[PDB]
Paper text:
Although OXA-48 hydrolyzes penicillins at high level, it hydrolyzes carbapenems at a low level and shows very weak activity against expanded-spectrum cephalosporins. OXA-405 is a peculiar OXA-48-like enzyme, as it has lost carbapenem activities and gained expanded-spectrum cephalosporin hydrolytic activity subsequent to a 4 amino-acid (AA) deletion in the β5–β6 loop. Kinetic parameters confirmed that OXA-405 behaves more like an ESBL ß-lactamase, rather than a carbapenemase.
The crystal structure of OXA-405 refined at 2.26 Å presents the typical class D fold with an α-helical region and a mixed α-helix/β-sheet region, with 96% of all residues inside the favored regions of the Ramachandran plot, 4% in the allowed regions, and no outliers. The asymmetric unit contains two protein chains, A and B, modeled with 246 residues each. In contrast, the R2 substituent of cephalosporins has unfavorable steric clashes with Arg214 in OXA-48 that are not observed in OXA-405, where this residue is absent and the β5–β6 loop is shorter. OXA-405 features a more open conformation of the active site due to the absence of Arg214 and its stabilizing interaction with Asp159, as well as the smaller size of the β5–β6 loop. This leads to an increased affinity for cephalosporins and a decreased stabilization of carbapenems in the active site, thus explaining the important differences in affinity for these substrates observed between OXA-48 and OXA-405.
Author numbering:
A (entry chain B), B (entry chain A): 22 to 214, 219 to 267
Amino acid sequence: MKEWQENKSWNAHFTEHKSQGVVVLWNENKQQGFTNNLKRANQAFLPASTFKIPNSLIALDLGVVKDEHQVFKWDGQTRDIATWNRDHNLITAMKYSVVPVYQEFARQIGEARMSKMLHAFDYGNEDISGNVDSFWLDGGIRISATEQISFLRKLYHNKLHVSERSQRIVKQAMLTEANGDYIIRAKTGYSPKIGWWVGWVELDDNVWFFAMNMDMPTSDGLGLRQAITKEVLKQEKIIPLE
Amino acid sequence: MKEWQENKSWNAHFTEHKSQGVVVLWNENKQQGFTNNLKRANQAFLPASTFKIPNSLIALDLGVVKDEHQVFKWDGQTRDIATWNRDHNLITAMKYSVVPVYQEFARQIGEARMSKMLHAFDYGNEDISGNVDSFWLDGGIRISATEQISFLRKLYHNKLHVSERSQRIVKQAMLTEANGDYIIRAKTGYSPKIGWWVGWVELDDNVWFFAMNMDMPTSDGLGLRQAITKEVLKQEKIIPLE
C-alpha cells in the first residue's frame, strides 16, 4: 500500500505566482506522500528533459558513456543555447541539459534497447515508433509526478536493473545544490506547455523525494519550477528559511 | 617534475584575519601549483580529521563499512560535541568528524592493514605509531599540504589502490558545497595548534585542488579555514564574487 495526503494549502504557492501545477513530496523514513493535488499528481505528461535521467543510466549501462569524464565533441552546429556550442561530458551535458548530446546517446542505444530498458525501469507508458531522438517531448512517452518519485526512489536505493556504478554516476551528474543543511540531486525539464523539477533532498537523517510539474504557456517562468518547490520545502520545514 | 609558484600576495588574506598559515592550490589542467609559502606548504603536521579521508577508504575497502548508509549506533555516552550523540552513517560521520565512529573503524582495520594501506597510498610519513585508534589524534602521523594534494589527486582520478566504488563513496561523503558555479569536496581538520581544509573545487572545464592549514591557538577561528581559502579562490577567479 502507498500513503498519500492531499495538502491544498500548497496551492497558494502556485496562485501567488499566477501559475498552476503540482508539487509531490515523499518522506522516505515515514513512507508517506504529500501533494497539493492528487488528481494532477497522477496525471501523465511528457518528461521533456527529465528524460535525461533514464537516458544517462541506459547509455552508461550499455557502454555508450564510458564514465562521467568522456568527452562528447560539439557537432559544429551553432544553436541558440550558447553552452551547447562546445564539448561536454556527462556532468556538464546534464547541467546545461545539452539535448544534441542526448539525441546522440538515444541513437546509439536504439529504440529496441531503449524500450526494453524503460520497461525494466517501469518508467511511464512508452510508444516509441521512429522517433528515438525526440520521444521524451513527442510524445512518445508520458510519466506522472508520482511515477517520477517511484523511479527516483529506485535510483536512490541502487535498485534499478543496471549496475550500482551506473546509478552512482547518474546520481553524481544529478548534483544540483549542496550546503551544510541539505543536498539536492535533481533534473529540470521543459517542453511546450509543461515545466518539471524532479529529484530529492538529502538530509542527515532522511531523504525527501520531489516531483513537480507546472503549466508553461511560454518559456518565461522557468525559475518558478525550483522557486515553487523550495517554497513548499520551506513551508514543510525540510529546508531552512533564507 | 612538479611546477610551483610562490605568490606572497595571498599572505594579506592571513594578515587581514590576524592569522598565519598556508594555502596550496593545484591547477589540474595546467599541472601547476600555487602557494603563498613554499616552506610551510611542505611542512608536515598531524592530519587530525583530514585523516577521515584515508580512514574511510580503508574501512570501505576491507568491508568494515558496507556502504554510505550503514548505521553506526550511538553508544549512549554523552560527549561534548552535540552532533556525536546520535547514530551516524559514513556521510554524517564525515560531516560531523565523529571521532568514536572512526576509532571503531580503526580498531576493526587493525595496525597491520592500516600501515600497509597508508604505504600503498603514499600518505604522508606513513607512521601509525602508536595506538591504532588515536595515532591521528595524538600520534606520529604527519602530512604536508603538498602531500595532501598528491593524495587527493589520486583519489579524484580513482588511482588509489582500493576499488573504484570505495573512492566514489568517499568522494560522495566529502561533498561540502555545490551550486551552478562549482562543486567543493573537502575535509576540515582540527587538533590543538593546527586547523586544516583539504579538497578540491570542480568546475565545468577544470579541477582546482587545495590544501590549507593555519595556526589555531584555540578552537575560536575555525571559520577562517574555509573563509581564507575562499578569499584566495576568489582572488584567483576560480570561484565568483558573492
